[PDB]
């Protein structure tokens, strides 16, 4: 998953 990963920094704060 892209939130998971700190490469994906999505709304998933």
């Known amino acids: 998953g892209a ?3 700190p ?3 999505y ?3």
């Open 7 to 9: 490469r994906a920094r």
């Open 3 to 5: 939130c998971s990963d």
């Open 11 to 13: 709304r998933c704060r």
